[PDB]
Design a protein around this nucleic acid. Sequence first.
DNA 1: ACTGTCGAAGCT
DNA 2: AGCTTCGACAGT
Length: 413
Amino acid sequence: SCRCVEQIIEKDEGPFYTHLGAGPNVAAIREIMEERFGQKGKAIRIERVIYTGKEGKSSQGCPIAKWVVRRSSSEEKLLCLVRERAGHTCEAAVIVILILVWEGIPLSLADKLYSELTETLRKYGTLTNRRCALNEERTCACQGLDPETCGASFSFGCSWSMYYNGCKFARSKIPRKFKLLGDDPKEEEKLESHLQNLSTLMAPTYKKLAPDAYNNQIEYEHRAPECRLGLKEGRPFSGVTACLDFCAHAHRDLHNMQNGSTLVCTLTREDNREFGGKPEDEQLHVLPLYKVSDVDEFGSVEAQEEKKRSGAIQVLSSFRRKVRMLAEPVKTCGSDEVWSDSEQSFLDPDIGGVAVAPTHGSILIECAKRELHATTPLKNPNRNHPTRISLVFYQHKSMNEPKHGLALWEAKM
DNA sequence: ACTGTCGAAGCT
DNA sequence: AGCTTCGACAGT
Ligand SMILES: O=C(O)CNC(=O)C(=O)O
Ligand SMILES: [Fe+3]
Ligand SMILES: [Zn+2]
Ligand SMILES: [Zn+2]
Ligand SMILES: [Zn+2]
């Protein structure tokens, strides 16, 4: 382990890791997942995806989906995406790259967080600028152009910093982990309470469904408690980002800690909260370097064709649409209409773009540090009534000092 | 052989 | 409120 080859050419077989789960064959994965979830059979659905290393993107460089994995029934509880490693016959020949639990949190609590975060971030939220907010040319308008309504990212908790090679709060007497506009401690505590309670609720589910990644993240819980979220023993998270109609361009989260993962809690607008329903718009979570198999979990071609026809796997087609492009790139230190298209991505069967359509209250686990990932731009982004809110829970690298690493930094004298 | 990042404190 | 120090790394 391993001897199937003599070097790991990730650029071809894809990134290799096992802390979400690994096994000799797809059947093995099902055994693991049935045991973890505590449910055999139809509750669990496994989709083979294939690493192609060729990125699906629009003519302007923005995210697109080529296939959508959709919840097949109310009977489906757990979605797993597995990669069969090209040219391997060992005990980690198949690995888990994504876990999605459809019924992640209580719907009543999801409904509430939707209202409360939308209202709170609206009024007091100070947005966090991220590289993945723009395409590579830095001229797209995927978030919308109205500053008041555009899709945005709001980051809370602790973050790693290059200046300190540690927590950004190295020099902070009393850190404000849930900092809002100006200074309004009653709103900030209200936000905190919501996100701490949510951190607390999700950690047990993280442990249950991805033990090894979870255990990696709590190794230093008692050494750096100031850089952890959560209200109870077992605190895998350190940072949390809220994304409101935010189009995250293809990226990896480089600052995240090695051998961890990301948990994403999804909240949707009220028109998209029933199974099978027909929402005006919809945001997808995409893995641009993968394609779907010709075959289902158990090896059948016909079973996989049924899913394509039922819609459990939606095969999308090329599209021409108009989008705006800034006259001048966004820096760091007016616009025109342009025809965007995806024909090229769709022409090549090996250009990727496997997407999932995460539901209200669902929880998605992936190794965002390793896998390229993206979210699709909304037709009409409006963070005042967003089509989708995602709450992304993570822990950065080198967050293992007490007191946000205060002593270690003052020691650098 | 360059670029660019889920920043905040202290002084002015 | 603006101007300054603080600098680890993956990508290309
Ligand atoms: O919102 C999602 O589904 C995924 N989000 C991200 O990758 C991010 O904010 O970095
Ligand atoms: Fe990400
Ligand atoms: Zn874009
Ligand atoms: Zn092998
Ligand atoms: Zn911290």
